[PDB]
Design an enzyme around this catalytic site. Structure first.
Site, PDB file in Angstrom:
ATOM      1  N   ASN A 189       0.766  -1.167   0.076  1.00 26.52           N
ATOM      2  CA  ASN A 189       0.137   0.183  -0.053  1.00 26.52           C
ATOM      3  C   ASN A 189       1.055   1.214   0.042  1.00 26.52           C
ATOM      4  OD1 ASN A 189      -1.923   2.080   0.396  1.00 26.52           O
ATOM      5  ND2 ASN A 189      -2.527   1.373   2.391  1.00 26.52           N
ATOM      6  N   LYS A 246       0.071   4.305  -0.527  1.00 28.74           N
ATOM      7  CA  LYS A 246      -0.524   5.496   0.140  1.00 28.74           C
ATOM      8  C   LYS A 246      -0.424   6.529  -0.696  1.00 28.74           C
ATOM      9  CE  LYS A 246       0.297   3.482   4.656  1.00 28.74           C
ATOM     10  NZ  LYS A 246      -0.017   3.473   6.265  1.00 28.74           N
ATOM     11  N   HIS A 253      -9.714   0.830   4.790  1.00 27.89           N
ATOM     12  CA  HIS A 253      -8.503   1.058   5.374  1.00 27.89           C
ATOM     13  C   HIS A 253      -8.636   2.199   6.605  1.00 27.89           C
ATOM     14  CE1 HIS A 253      -4.304   2.222   5.804  1.00 27.89           C
ATOM     15  NE2 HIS A 253      -3.963   1.102   5.442  1.00 27.89           N
ATOM     16  N   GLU A 265      -7.058   4.694   7.702  1.00 27.68           N
ATOM     17  CA  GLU A 265      -6.995   5.995   7.271  1.00 27.68           C
ATOM     18  C   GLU A 265      -8.447   6.628   6.529  1.00 27.68           C
ATOM     19  OE1 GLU A 265      -3.464   5.620   4.932  1.00 27.68           O
ATOM     20  OE2 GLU A 265      -2.198   5.195   6.742  1.00 27.68           O
ATOM     21  N   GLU A 270      -5.360  -5.136  10.638  1.00 25.34           N
ATOM     22  CA  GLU A 270      -4.362  -3.995  10.817  1.00 25.34           C
ATOM     23  C   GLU A 270      -4.923  -3.151  12.053  1.00 25.34           C
ATOM     24  OE1 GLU A 270      -4.487  -2.017   6.896  1.00 25.34           O
ATOM     25  OE2 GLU A 270      -2.290  -2.885   6.854  1.00 25.34           O
ATOM     26  N   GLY A 309       2.073   2.502  10.941  1.00 29.40           N
ATOM     27  CA  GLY A 309       3.030   3.623  10.647  1.00 29.40           C
ATOM     28  C   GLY A 309       3.541   3.946  11.964  1.00 29.40           C
ATOM     29  N   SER A 317       3.098  -2.036  10.280  1.00 27.81           N
ATOM     30  CA  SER A 317       4.823  -2.061  10.666  1.00 27.81           C
ATOM     31  C   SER A 317       5.272  -3.534  10.258  1.00 27.81           C
ATOM     32  CB  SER A 317       4.950  -1.711  11.909  1.00 27.81           C
ATOM     33  OG  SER A 317       4.477  -0.275  12.146  1.00 27.81           O
TER      34      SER A 317
END
Lengths: 247, 247
Positions: free
Chosen positions: A10, A12, A94, A96, A164, A170, A210
């Site tokens: 991904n 992003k 996702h 985000e 996730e 991140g 991560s």
């Protein structure tokens, strides 16, 4: 009948044609192993570019889409546009999207149903927040997210579930093999209880947050962890090591 | 000097490579008159495609972007990506973004500042809802929206302001020439009082909301209407008549 190891990258909101073309060139020159499905999800401006530049052994995913075929939705794209560009997947729900851009479970569910009706695969994302985990409600949170996804899936052949933990995205703080395995075993039990044994045994449940070259082999060894959704490390040649996590 | 007439075609979430390629062929064949600036905004997956197919006489816009250069924003694109695909404009604050997707004035202002710092032109959209027009607070609404935009504009050279009353978008209820002129003249007055006479005189204020071949001449005749943001009719050869509205 073993589940095929799946690694999605991904990207992003990162990259330009120069830097992404170079990352693509690395992937093109790499030997992708046996029984290993690799998918790259570029920024939406570069779905077409990525698919033009990538060897067909690597699939392309959209990072998001909307929930009808066409309409008055400035700034959105539809499953039909993604397929038109030669991409075969979309990432839905996702972290985000949910927590920065306020996308609801209901909306996610609608997207899943429409993407699948139009013949795309869906990488459907779930996961708890650090405060949810602290409050003892990890399972409850991911089961409800999964349920809303499941309510909108008729054919699981085209779906991959990506767990996730929000706190692992991140931050550098990868879930340990035990933490991931615990959740993934519970999610597969959910599928067994609520859909079918065949669906529980065949559906890939991938881990993200991560994932790195240093953590991937021990995570990939866990019996209910079937692959990865890789953010940061997918912009580095380290991605090839993660693709080879089972080798 | 006089303000150059400006026509933006917002394709929204419509089209595929075949249909958009046909539309592009029509535009490439069309006359674009003297001192007319024409911009087409394709779906995000087709910015690159559209720029490659369109003749340099027509600029390309993204339909939206985010407020930083790069980062962990799955599903978003930056001004840098837009410029990298050869587009030169972004549309910001479109009605759909504000009212379907919840984009705040604060966020739009941030995007404007970022897009302009990155060298893109901006089509900055404003407009009242039906209930706001009925309540008699159109002016208060559109001035507040303009203020947030103006607070994030240091140089108006590359900005176009687009007034699109929500009640006219997609509804067939085109604002009358009087209604548009009335709002435009107040917006230009706002710019004079709040920025400068020079900014008021030079800044294009374009109208959108059911602009059509049948309505465009009389709208374009109004002294404070400098052009159009066209939705539905931008998907058709009709767009050429609107481009040629002052001819």
């Amino acid at each position: 009948p073993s589940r095929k190891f799946f690694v999605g990258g991904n990207w992003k909101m990162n990259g330009r044609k120069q830097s992404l073309g170079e990352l693509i060139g690395t992937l093109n020159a790499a030997k992708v192993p046996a029984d290993t499905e690799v998918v790259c999800a570029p920024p939406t401006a570069y779905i077409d570019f990525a698919r033009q530049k990538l060897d067909p052994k690597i699939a392309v995913a959209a990072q998001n889409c909307y929930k009808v075929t066409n309409g008055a939705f400035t700034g959105e794209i539809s499953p039909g546009m993604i397929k038109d560009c030669g991409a075969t997947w979309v990432v839905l729900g996702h972290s985000e999207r949910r927590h920065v851009f306020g996308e609801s479970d209901e909306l996610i569910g609608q997207k899943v149903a429409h993407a699948l009706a139009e013949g795309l695969g869906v990488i459907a994302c779930i996961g708890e927040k650090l405060d949810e985990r602290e409050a003892g409600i990890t399972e409850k949170v991911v089961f409800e997210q999964t349920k809303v996804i499941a309510d909108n899936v008729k054919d699981w052949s085209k779906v991959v579930l990506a767990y996730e933990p929000v706190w692992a995205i991140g931050t550098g703080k990868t879930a340990t093999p035990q933490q991931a395995q615990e959740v993934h075993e519970k999610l597969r039990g959910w599928l067994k209880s609520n859909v079918s044994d065949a669906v529980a045994q065949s559906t890939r449940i991938i881990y993200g947050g991560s994932v790195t070259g240093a953590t991937c082999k021990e995570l990939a060894s866990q019996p209910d962890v079937d692959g990865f959704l890789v953010g940061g490390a997918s912009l580095k040649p380290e991605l090839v090591d993660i693709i080879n996590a089972k080798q």
